[PDB]
Ligand binder design. Structure first.
Ligand SMILES: Nc1nc2c(ncn2[C@@H]2O[C@H](COP(=O)(O)OP(=O)(O)OP(=O)(O)O)[C@@H](O)[C@H]2O)c(=O)[nH]1
Ligand SMILES: [Mn+2]
Ligand SMILES: [Mn+2]
Ligand code: NA
Length: 612
């Protein structure tokens, strides 16, 4: 009767008419709601990318890092990398489907919001929120195009930084739209929450709305709706919202697993290769392991992924894993030639850095780079101030990131994009435990291994030790007890070849606070032991917590005087306290949804400890 709800006049790249019907409805419906000035349907081309970077550069949104080949630096409003799992929620009809109902306290395992409450929140945020801005339409694949394990999303965003970063971290553009056709997709809606004219002053040329920041997941509607943050997991909606929260619920429904795991391939000196997955929390070194440079001669490690694993048993019973990401969104501080040489070589081109320091010669700098600068070279911190080594403040934000293409990693695995995925033979859990937990132990069974994941604890970074089951505490898409049952159910599947489960601790300290294990490339010696155990080698000693390496089973040559007594010590007094703490945690936090098999493993461990 007038123009309908036809936004064709506002399209500045692409065509609404060429979009699949349901994608068009999603775009136009949100264009009506958010009132963007323009619509840009991303094609994923190199020209689109380069021009958007130059535009952001011209506006002061990012700076070019002149030392490198096509690298860039964004400095955020410091409010936009504050703690916001308080503002991260999942909407379902029933709270219990999202989190177990705890016995004593508040839940640590997720944060539910009612549908009613969410609709009020949404109505208070999104209407007119993109006024004066371009709505970018990002078609993206999580996983290799045409992998039967891949899933597709469409992200609408008003942030060019999100567009640039999603090109790196996902497969993005016209080829995705063509692969999608009329199939299902996850609807991803994002706004920085700063319509023009700006109602509040812009800090550091970084649009955000901290007071209204809210990151919502609606698994029954296949929707992620995120408002007010331009940063990381809040804005790149593939990264955690899709990769873990939505995907874990899809996995539950469909019979697969979505996990906070690296995936690596390891080849021995006789050419035999195995793939392993490992779940460690933030600050516990997944990215270091995934890209490891092994010290043991004749061994090779190659990287499939450093953060997310989507895993499904195939008809032959093999546990096939893909990396659903297209890049590495890695913590910058602590990355050096020493700790991650392969990362150092990946990130010197075509990489976007956020919240690190800049050197006067146009390079990057951060705590732990271990790379001295020439006299006269000066440093600008992530707060855009002159910075000196003898100051209180760090030069980079402690969780600042690089965002780099996976294809550039010099040890990227030749099957990192194989659509069928890679066959996983081992799953590793671990965190930071300064006391009591040995370097490595092996679980006694699948059920025991699921308990080991469930019981994971890690020192926060007096000190505090917190539970982080499966390294998924921030990320469960649904009730953690039901997740445990889902894991346990894999054992009753036809022909499943259940991988061996291990627990590691890189972080045990002696009584003066010194690390007992050197770690990093030396962890290859632990992987050698795991490799042998998967192969059935008689290299294990039974203990109350699981199997540990026999005396002399680990290759310790070249390590000198490693204190093996302390590094492998298992104390009854420590483990008595441990099991009690785990018992109380699971009772409180999982309560009526704790599977029988987990409670049984808890009872069994308590019993074996009692007989020490
Ligand atoms: N002592 C020791 N520290 C390690 C080792 N591997 C990694 N680290 C430490 O782990 C930290 C880096 O881990 P992150 O990159 O935060 O961990 P991540 O698991 O990749 O975290 P996300 O990217 O947030 O998922 C640094 O403090 C490293 O020094 C190791 O083998 N030994
Ligand atoms: Mn990482
Ligand atoms: Mn992570
Ligand atoms: Na900035």
């Amino acid at each position: 009767l007038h123009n309908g709800l036809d936004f064709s006049a506002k399209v500045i790249q692409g065509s609404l008419d060429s979009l699949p019907q349901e994608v068009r409805k999603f775009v136009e419906g949100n264009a009506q709601l958010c009132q963007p000035e323009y619509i840009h349907i991303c094609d994923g081309s190199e020209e689109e990318y380069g021009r958007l970077l130059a535009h952001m550069q011209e506006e002061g949104v990012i700076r070019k890092l002149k030392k490198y080949d096509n690298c860039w630096l964004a400095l955020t409003d410091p409010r936009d990398v504050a703690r916001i799992d308080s503002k991260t929620v999942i909407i379902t009809q029933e709270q219990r489907d999202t989190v177990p109902i705890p016995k004593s306290g508040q839940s640590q395992l997720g944060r539910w919001m009612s549908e009613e409450d969410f609709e009020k929140a949404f109505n208070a945020r999104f209407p007119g929120c993109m006024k004066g801005r371009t709505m970018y339409v990002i078609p993206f694949s999580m996983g290799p195009l045409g992998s039967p394990l891949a899933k597709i999303g469409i992200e609408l965003t008003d942030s060019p930084y999100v567009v640039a970063s999603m090109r790196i971290m996902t497969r993005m553009g016209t080829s995705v739209l063509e692969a999608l056709g009329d199939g299902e997709f996850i609807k991803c809606l994002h706004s920085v929450g700063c319509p023009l004219p700006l109602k509040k002053p812009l800090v550091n040329n970084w649009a955000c709305n901290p007071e209204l920041t809210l990151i919502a997941h609606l698994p029954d509607r296949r929707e992620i709706i995120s408002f007010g943050s331009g940063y990381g997991g809040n804005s790149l909606l593939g990264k955690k919202c899709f990769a873990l929260r939505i995907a874990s619920r899809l996995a539950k429904e469909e019979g697969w697993l979505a996990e906070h795991m690296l995936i690596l391939g390891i080849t021995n000196p006789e050419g035999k290769k195995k793939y392993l997955a490992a779940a460690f929390p933030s600050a516990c070194g997944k990215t270091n392991l995934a890209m490891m440079n092994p010290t043991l001669p004749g061994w090779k490690v190659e990287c499939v992924g450093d953060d997310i694993a989507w895993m499904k048993f195939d008809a032959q019973g093999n546990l096939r894993a893909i990396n659903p990401e297209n890049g590495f969104f890695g913590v910058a501080p602590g990355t050096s030639v020493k700790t991650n040489p392969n990362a150092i070589k990946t990130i010197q081109k075509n990489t976007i850095f956020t919240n690190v320091a800049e050197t006067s010669d146009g390079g990057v700098y951060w705590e732990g780079i271990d790379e001295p600068l020439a006299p006269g070279v000066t440093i600008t911190s992530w707060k855009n101030k002159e910075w000196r080594p003898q100051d209180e403040e760090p030069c980079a934000h402690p969780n600042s990131r690089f965002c780099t293409p996976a294809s550039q990693c010099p040890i990227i695995d030749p099957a990192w994009e194989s659509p069928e995925g890679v066959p996983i033979e081992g799953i590793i859990f671990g965190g930071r435990r300064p006391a009591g937990v040995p370097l490595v132990y092996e679980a006694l069974s699948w059920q025991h291994g699921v308990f080991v994941g469930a019981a994971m604890r890690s020192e926060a970074t007096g000190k505090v030790i917190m539970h982080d089951p499966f390294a998924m505490r921030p990320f469960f898409g649904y009730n953690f007890g039901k997740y445990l049952a889902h894991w346990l159910s894999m054992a009753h599947r036809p022909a499943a070849k259940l991988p061996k489960i291990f627990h590691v601790n890189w972080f045990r300290k002696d009584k003066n606070g010194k690390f007992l294990w050197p770690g990093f490339g030396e962890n290859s010696r632990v992987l050698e032991w795991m490799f042998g155990r998967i192969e059935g080698e008689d290299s294990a000693k039974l203990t109350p917590i699981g199997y540990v390496p026999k005396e002399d089973a680990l290759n310790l040559k070249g390590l000198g005087d490693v204190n093996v007594e302390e590094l492998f010590g298992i104390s009854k007094e420590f483990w008595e306290k441990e099991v009690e703490e785990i018992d109380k945690y699971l009772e409180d936090q999982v309560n009526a949804d704790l599977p029988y098999e987990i409670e049984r493993e808890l009872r069994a461990l308590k019993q074996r400890i009692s007989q020490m």
